[PDB]
Design an enzyme around this catalytic site. Structure first.
Site, PDB file in Angstrom:
ATOM      1  CD  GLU A   1       1.886   8.030   0.749  1.00  0.00           C
ATOM      2  OE1 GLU A   1       2.136   6.832   1.028  1.00  0.00           O
ATOM      3  OE2 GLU A   1       0.981   8.689   1.309  1.00  0.00           O
TER       4      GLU A   1
ATOM      5  CD  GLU B   1      -1.616  -0.068   3.615  1.00  0.00           C
ATOM      6  OE1 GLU B   1      -2.604   0.661   3.361  1.00  0.00           O
ATOM      7  OE2 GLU B   1      -1.442  -0.630   4.724  1.00  0.00           O
TER       8      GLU B   1
HETATM    9  N1  LIG Z   1      10.693   1.614  -0.319  1.00  0.00           N
HETATM   10  C1  LIG Z   1      10.216   1.148   0.841  1.00  0.00           C
HETATM   11  N2  LIG Z   1      10.802   0.057   1.386  1.00  0.00           N
HETATM   12  C2  LIG Z   1      10.289  -0.456   2.514  1.00  0.00           C
HETATM   13  N3  LIG Z   1       9.237  -0.033   3.223  1.00  0.00           N
HETATM   14  C3  LIG Z   1       8.673   1.044   2.656  1.00  0.00           C
HETATM   15  C4  LIG Z   1       9.091   1.685   1.497  1.00  0.00           C
HETATM   16  N4  LIG Z   1       8.222   2.709   1.152  1.00  0.00           N
HETATM   17  C5  LIG Z   1       7.272   2.618   2.057  1.00  0.00           C
HETATM   18  N5  LIG Z   1       7.516   1.696   3.047  1.00  0.00           N
HETATM   19  C6  LIG Z   1       6.907   1.419   4.336  1.00  0.00           C
HETATM   20  O1  LIG Z   1       5.621   0.895   4.060  1.00  0.00           O
HETATM   21  C7  LIG Z   1       4.601   1.641   4.744  1.00  0.00           C
HETATM   22  C8  LIG Z   1       5.330   2.486   5.784  1.00  0.00           C
HETATM   23  O2  LIG Z   1       5.375   1.797   7.024  1.00  0.00           O
HETATM   24  C9  LIG Z   1       6.708   2.702   5.151  1.00  0.00           C
HETATM   25  O3  LIG Z   1       7.757   2.964   6.075  1.00  0.00           O
HETATM   26  C10 LIG Z   1       3.465   2.180   3.850  1.00  0.00           C
HETATM   27  C11 LIG Z   1       2.393   2.713   4.785  1.00  0.00           C
HETATM   28  C12 LIG Z   1       2.295   4.075   5.070  1.00  0.00           C
HETATM   29  C13 LIG Z   1       1.336   4.552   5.950  1.00  0.00           C
HETATM   30  C14 LIG Z   1       0.486   3.660   6.552  1.00  0.00           C
HETATM   31  F1  LIG Z   1      -0.384   4.084   7.487  1.00  0.00           F
HETATM   32  C15 LIG Z   1       0.554   2.319   6.258  1.00  0.00           C
HETATM   33  F2  LIG Z   1      -0.242   1.465   6.935  1.00  0.00           F
HETATM   34  C16 LIG Z   1       1.482   1.835   5.367  1.00  0.00           C
HETATM   35  C17 LIG Z   1       3.786   3.150   2.697  1.00  0.00           C
HETATM   36  C18 LIG Z   1       5.137   3.837   2.618  1.00  0.00           C
HETATM   37  N6  LIG Z   1       6.068   3.139   1.743  1.00  0.00           N
END
Ligand SMILES: Nc1ncnc2c1nc1n2[C@@H]2O[C@@H]([C@@H](O)[C@H]2O)[C@@H](c2ccc(F)c(F)c2)CCN1
Lengths: 625, 311
Positions: free
Chosen positions: A432, A423
């Site tokens: 994002e 997500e």
């Molecule tokens: N390139 C990458 N490698 C690893 N993990 C990564 C990443 N990019 C992200 N994420 C991690 O995934 C989530 C965050 O925890 C983020 O730290 C996700 C999220 C955001 C808000 C929410 F309330 C939710 F439930 C989930 C979206 C952000 N994208």
């Protein structure tokens, strides 16, 4: 309940009159601060040396009462735009005197009329008052929906009323307001008191006041019908407008004498409270949004920033979101492993950006539902979120889930995946950096692998809102470009606004990206047909996504995934507002740009007129890679 | 000695001065400043005793201020009130008190101008609510309500002898000639040029198709209804013309009021015969003595009753 007030142009004893209106059930009083008939002279002797007092003493009420219960009123003889020099000069001095008395008194608001086209000198005198010391006082511009000249009785034989439709002419009072507030340079201290008359105008005319700072609605007694039991009521059309205005949280003002002499003055009030209690209830979205209406927020950058614990909590209390993720996984697993293999074929499922684990649990509930075998990997870059994950993996999940404390772009996976789930989307889909993240990850996806979500599309719609333009205009910070606030998107629960044309798709991304030369940069031209006369202030953005097959998520108003109160729309402002005539097309250009370090948007309006390119080289706004 | 139910103090701002056919003086006054913003009605069988309170025939206090006044015969007083009400105050048999016959709140804002129609059984009122209302004084009701104007109604003037006819003028720059007999009662009349806003109206007491109007720039205009392109006009005042009153003479004089605190007296050609600077504040009314036709009594916001000698 209902914040309502009483308009009086006659107050013989200020103390007695106030008690009576409070007894009737009024939260405040609109009254003259000098006698309405009491013309003062400032230049010519002998009238210049007229002995005092010039009005009643401030000692007649407590400071608290003046501060909360009294809205002051300009005197009706004050005409700063009179064609007679002598009158212009006295009206200027009289306007200053009354406005300064209102400020002395500590009044929360003051009423000034727009009852003619030319209000330039009135605007000049108000502007000069507004810049004479910094104060919190509000100015309510008393504007009618319909100019009095256009509602007069057809009783002059040699000057009949024009029966021919005049589309633009029927909106003349909005132009009176627009010019006045343009001359006053969009002061946050200047708002509308919208006067509603016996016969409402065309719907387009009422639609002009969409996005305007309406602070009060003025209902004269003259417009209330009489019901069978003799009570005052309103036409169904008038009720619609009240329902529309309750949403704007306006203060309703009762003006005119009582014409329902059988009943009291709480009768007009009781109808409003009755209408207030009988409105379609605030749904899960409307109830969640309460407090965030037109409140500008910065878009989340969860890649660049480690999200706080309470940000995750907000975007977890959304069961519809994870029901759809569960459903998309359930449906995918059945399409990948048949009933014969339901215990031999174990699926490599990677949750990429696992947060605190709701997507992980959703992948679990979708393995048991589909009655198929899955090996879970929970990747997460935020080390604080990984704490919640590693406690979950110990206390509940066990050996089934493998928590990976890495960014998906830098992780070296031991085995390739069947399904990568994420997500990584924001309010404008790709804002994002979901394209970039998922491109850096697709190497560890099998050649026949599935990405959930598999597709997403952003949409744009042109909007009018002088409230939101002013809200943005107020976001100036020291030590940065004085105009950088207009060159950045805002997540905002768009409330007091007008959508000028149907949302149209902007940028689309597909996963996996089978392109040999993958380019996430974009250029899109949109042509928005406009059938109103309006002022363009910016562009609302929404998204749509396909998790799997028919299972989707949407914040596009037309196709909105019901219950998803999480995602609010994004707003792309423009530095200078643009007049758009009925029949004109708004043409907007949008770019999605990048380098090795950052991603951003740039946008420009090319039709009906040109704007500057907003955010060139990501100077005011970038999304950190 | 002070009459019963009458206050020992008079409201500083004198609004109306009206002589009855016997010679008794009617005074309307408002409190336009200070704690209490109200009005009062005073009768002076001895006109030389006015404005003094303790030397009056009758006196009453109204809830709100007196914007305009008219005699309803010899015992009636029709009041244009700030309250949005038209008040009819009935005089006493011994003429010692002033008692409220009716108080009707029909106008949605200050009532600014009242005129009693030739029969004495009907009246027209003009208001800041932009309406014009025809009243039946016996039934205490509005017969007809006209939203002819687009701005506040400044002056309503009933015709000398026709009950159907009256003039009205407004900040919308219209002078309307009315005839309740036509299906479209009002008719836009005035000079060729749009000019300045109309402020005061007065019919000629002899020529029934002729009237005079004062503008906001102090100009007095002699207008014939028929020709509908003004014959004569003179700049009589330096400020807004408040009121215009014709003398009771067979060949009448025109008394001109103003916010320039002066009174002027003019002939048929609008030429200046007399001028008085007697007042220190705005000149609000004028009445000629029914007895001595060469006498003219003005009131002002300076609480002065000035009796003039017009040669
Ligand atoms: N390139 C990458 N490698 C690893 N993990 C990564 C990443 N990019 C992200 N994420 C991690 O995934 C989530 C965050 O925890 C983020 O730290 C996700 C999220 C955001 C808000 C929410 F309330 C939710 F439930 C989930 C979206 C952000 N994208």
């Amino acid at each position: 309940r209902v914040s309502s007030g009483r308009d009086l142009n006659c107050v013989p004893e200020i103390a007695d009159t106030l008690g009576a209106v409070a007894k009737q059930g009024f939260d405040f009083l609109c009254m003259p601060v000098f006698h309405p008939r009491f013309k003062r002279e400032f230049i010519q002797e002998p009238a210049k040396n007229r002995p005092g007092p010039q009005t009643r003493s401030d000692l007649l009420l407590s400071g608290r009462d003046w501060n909360t219960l009294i809205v002051g009123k300009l005197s009706p003889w004050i005409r700063p735009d009179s064609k007679v020099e002598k009158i212009r000069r006295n009206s200027e001095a009289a306007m200053l005197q009354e406005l300064n008395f209102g400020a002395y008194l500590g009044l929360p608001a003051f009423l000034l009329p727009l009852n003619q086209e030319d209000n330039t000198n009135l605007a000049r005198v108000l502007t000069n008052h507004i810049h004479t010391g910094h104060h919190s006082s509000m100015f309510w511009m008393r504007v009618p929906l319909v100019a009095p000249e256009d509602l007069r009785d057809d009783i002059i034989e040699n000057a009949p009323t024009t029966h021919t439709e005049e589309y633009s002419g029927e909106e003349k009072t909005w132009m009176w307001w627009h010019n006045f507030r343009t001359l006053c340079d969009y002061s946050k201290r200047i708002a509308v008191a919208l006067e509603i008359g016996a016969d409402l105008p065309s719907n387009h005319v009422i639609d002009r006041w969409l996005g305007e700072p309406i602070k009060a609605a003025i209902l004269p007694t003259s417009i209330f019908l009489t019901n069978k039991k003799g009570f005052p009521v309103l036409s169904k059309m008038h009720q619609r407008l009240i329902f529309r205005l309750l949403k704007l949280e306006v203060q309703f003002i009762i003006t005119g004498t009582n014409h329902h002499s059988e009943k009291e003055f709480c009768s007009y009030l009781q109808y409003l409270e009755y209408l207030s209690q009988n409105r379609p209830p605030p749904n899960a979205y409307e109830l969640f949004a309460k407090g965030y209406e037109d409140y500008l927020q910065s878009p989340l950058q969860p890649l660049m920033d480690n999200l706080e614990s309470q940000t995750y909590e907000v975007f977890e209390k959304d069961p519809i979101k994870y029901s759809q993720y569960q459903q998309a996984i359930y449906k995918c697993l059945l399409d990948r492993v048949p009933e014969e293999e339901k215990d031999t074929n174990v699926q490599v499922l990677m949750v990429l950006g696992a947060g605190r684990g709701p997507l992980v649990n959703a992948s679990l509930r979708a393995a048991k539902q589909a009655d198929r075998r899955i090996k879970l990997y929970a990747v997460e870059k935020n080390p604080n979120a990984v704490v919640t994950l590693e406690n979950w993996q110990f206390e509940e999940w066990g050996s089934q889930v493998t928590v990976v404390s890495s960014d998906m772009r830098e992780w070296v996976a031991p085995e390739k995946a069947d399904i990568i789930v994420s997500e990584l989307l924001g309010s404008f889909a790709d804002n994002e950096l979901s394209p970039e993240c998922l491109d850096g990850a697709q190497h560890f996806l099998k050649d026949d692998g599935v990405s959930i979500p598999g597709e997403y599309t952003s949409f744009l719609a042109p909007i009018s809102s002088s409230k939101l333009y002013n809200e943005v205009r107020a976001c100036r910070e020291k030590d940065r470009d004085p105009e950088a606030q207009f060159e950045m998107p805002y997540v905002v629960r768009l409330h007091n606004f007008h959508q000028l044309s149907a949302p149209q798709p902007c940028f689309t991304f597909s996963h996996p990206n089978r392109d040999p030369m993958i380019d996430n940069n974009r250029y899109c031209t949109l042509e928005f047909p406009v059938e109103v006369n309006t002022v363009l202030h910016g562009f609302a953005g929404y998204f749509e996504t396909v998790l799997y097959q028919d299972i989707t998520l949407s914040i596009r108003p037309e196709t909105h995934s019901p219950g998803m109160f999480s995602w609010f729309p994004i707003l792309f402002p423009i530095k200078q507002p643009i007049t758009v005539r009925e029949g004109q097309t708004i043409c907007v250009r949008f770019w999605r740009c990048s380098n090795s370090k950052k991603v951003w948007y740039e946008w420009a309006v090319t039709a009906p007129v040109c704007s500057a390119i907003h955010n060139p080289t990501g100077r005011s706004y970038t999304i950190g890679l | 000695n002070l009459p019963p139910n009458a206050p020992a103090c008079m409201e500083r701002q004198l609004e109306a001065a009206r002589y009855r056919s016997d010679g008794a003086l009617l005074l309307g006054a408002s409190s336009l400043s200070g704690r209490c913003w109200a009005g009062s009605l005073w009768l002076f069988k001895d006109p030389c005793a006015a404005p003094n309170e303790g030397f009056c025939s009758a006196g009453v206090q109204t809830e709100a201020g007196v914007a305009d006044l008219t005699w309803v015969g010899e015992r009636g007083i029709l009041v244009a009130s700030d309250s949005g009400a038209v008040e009819l105050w009935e005089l006493d048999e011994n003429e010692t008190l002033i008692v409220s016959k009716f108080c009707k709140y029909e106008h949605d804002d200050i009532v600014s101008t009242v005129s009693v129609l030739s029969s004495g059984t009907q009246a027209v009122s003009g208001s800041k609510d932009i309406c014009i209302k025809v009243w039946d004084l016996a039934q205490q009701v509005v017969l007809s309500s006209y939203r002819a104007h687009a701005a506040q109604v400044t002056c309503v003037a009933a015709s000398p002898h026709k009950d159907s006819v009256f003039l009205s003028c407004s900040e919308d720059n219209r002078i309307l000639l009315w005839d309740t007999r036509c299906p479209k009662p009002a008719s836009q009349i005035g000079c060729s040029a749009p000019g300045y806003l109309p402020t005061s109206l007065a019919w000629h007491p002899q020529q029934s198709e002729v009237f005079v109007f004062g503008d906001e720039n102090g100009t007095v205009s002699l207008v014939d209804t028929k020709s509908t392109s003004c014959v004569l006009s003179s700049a009589v005042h330096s400020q807004c013309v408040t009121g215009l009153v014709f003398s009771p003479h067979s060949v009448p004089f025109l008394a001109s009021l103003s916010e320039d605190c002066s009174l002027a007296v003019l002939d048929s050609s609008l030429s200046e015969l007399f001028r008085s600077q007697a007042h220190r504040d705005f000149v609000r009314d004028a009445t000629w003595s029914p007895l001595n036709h060469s006498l003219l009594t003005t009131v002002g916001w300076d609480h002065q009753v000035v009796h003039h000698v017009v040669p």
